[PDB]
Design a protein around this ligand. Sequence first.
Ligand code: APR
Length: 190
Amino acid sequence: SFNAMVVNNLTLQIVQGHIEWQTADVIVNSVNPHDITVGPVAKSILQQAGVEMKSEFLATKAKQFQRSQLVLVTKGFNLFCKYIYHVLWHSEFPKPQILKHAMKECLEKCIEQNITSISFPALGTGNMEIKKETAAEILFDEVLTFAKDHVKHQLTVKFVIFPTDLEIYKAFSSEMAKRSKMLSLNNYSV
Ligand SMILES: Nc1ncnc2c1ncn2[C@@H]1O[C@H](COP(=O)(O)OP(=O)(O)OC[C@H]2O[C@@H](O)[C@H](O)[C@@H]2O)[C@@H](O)[C@H]1O
């Protein structure tokens, strides 16, 4: 069994744990921009970051928010991270399409803000009801695009699967196995 792969300058690991207890430069949240207190990832991150993060979210939303915005950045506050990238769900468009755009944008922001590590939950797989295999294929696709198109930018990416979401874990681990075999990647068990 394995839970990590290395491709070019990118390390990808699947972790069973809590997104809000990660240590990384960036931790990714998943919210309704009109109420960041709804949803288990959202509540998890908010309670751990603290109420000051919500204040900053709201103030940044007032300055920046528009229909085109898919990712809003705040500081990490009491989280063990520099920034939180809040993925914003606020349209009627197909959720896998939104996911793909939001994933690419989070990774592109890693260049802009010179980020060395980023930890994602299984975005879209809860309230947004994206099929586990679809979510896995999109997340892997965008990470591998990054690894090829931004080859000089070292990055450690973690996909953090809630401990009891075993079916999601298995879908992500199956995807890792498929990509690793095809690309002859070296795998690790941590
Ligand atoms: N603390 C946690 N750490 C890691 N993963 C978690 C945690 N809590 C929940 N998860 C998992 O994260 C995934 C995403 O679930 P949601 O939090 O429901 O988020 P998502 O499916 O992306 O939908 C976001 C939507 O829900 C609310 O934020 C709001 O309505 C927003 O638009 C699911 O697999 C869920 O079980």
